[PDB]
Amino acid sequence: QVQLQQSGAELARPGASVKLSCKASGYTFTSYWMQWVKQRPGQGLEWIGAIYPGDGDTRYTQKFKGKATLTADKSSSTAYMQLSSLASEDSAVYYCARRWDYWGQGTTLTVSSAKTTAPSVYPLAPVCSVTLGCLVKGYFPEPVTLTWNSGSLSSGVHTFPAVLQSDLYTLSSSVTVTSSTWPSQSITCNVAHPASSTKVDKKIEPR
């Protein structure tokens, strides 16, 4: 299995610099070009550049000259992209890819002067099939990762996109199971927030 492991989500201040990593495995690192691609929210894919670790050759598109610097470490099979002089326009998801076939999961970069805020997670039980809810509010920045139990109820899960009110993000998620599932079996809302390194489990319990 060819795999490309990209570094985790990043929060950086304007003017600062970040070094995104992409560790490769499952193939010969020095025999293929590693591609880097940018994607702003709701926008298309934008090619940044490429590196050939075998000999250190690099290619860039005009818009990303200076902004992006591509390097590679053969001993660790890791491709790096340094994004310098960061501005709000650099806030995006960045992918690494070997040619066209294999893609990393992407790294979300947020460029902001605002501080990290851990979310408050609330369980939402029904009023006094069944639908349960989980409220995640007052966090910064995106993203958060919400999952129900071990991701087995994902067939009936709707996790809604975060809304931004007063510089903080608020998210909610619904899970719909048959009435024989809950509260007979336990259902837990699992929320993770990398930027604040917070992981909280809230069990949906009857009111």
Partner 1 sequence: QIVMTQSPSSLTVTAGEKVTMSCKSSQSLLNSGNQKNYLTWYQQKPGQPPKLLIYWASTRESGVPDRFTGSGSGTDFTLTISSVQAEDLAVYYCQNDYSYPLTFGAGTKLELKRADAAPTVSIFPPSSEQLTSGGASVVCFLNNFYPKDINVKWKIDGSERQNGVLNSWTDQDSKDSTYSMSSTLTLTKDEYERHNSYTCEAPIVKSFNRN
Judged by the rule CB under 8 A, the positions of this chain that interact with partner 1 are 35, 37, 44-47, 49-50, 59-62, 95, 99-101, 103-106, 120, 122-128, 131, 133, 135, 137, 158-163, 165, 170, 172, 174, 176, 207
Q: Which of 85/129 has CB closer to partner 1?
A: 129
**Given the rule CB under 5 A, which residues bind Cl ion?**
12-13, 16, 30, 46-47
Cα torsion 52, 53, 59, 64 to 10°: value is 140
In sequence order, what are the residues at sequence separation of 6 or more whose Cβ sits closer than 8 angstroms to the Cβ of residue 5?
22, 23, 24, 25, 104
Residue 96 pairs in a beta bridge with: 36
- CA 159, 164, 165, 166 torsion-angle sign: positive
Cβ 26 to Cl ion, closest distance in Å?
Answer: 14
Q: How many helices (H) and strands (E) does the chain have?
A: 0, 19
CB nearer to partner 1: pick between 50 and 111: 50
Which of partner 1, Cl ion, none has residue 137 at its interface (CB below 5 to 8 Å by kind)?
A: partner 1
Complex with partner 1: residue 60 or 80, whichever CB lies closer = 60
Query: Nearest 5°: phi and psi at 90?
Result: -85, -10
Q: Work out how close the CB of 13 gets to partner 1 at its nearest, in angstroms, rounded to a whole number.
A: 27
Residue 59's binding partner out of partner 1, Cl ion, none, with CB under 5 to 8 Å set by partner kind: partner 1
Dihedral angle of Cα 113, 118, 122, 123, to the nearest 10 degrees: 120
Which of 66, 113 has the CB closer to partner 1? 66
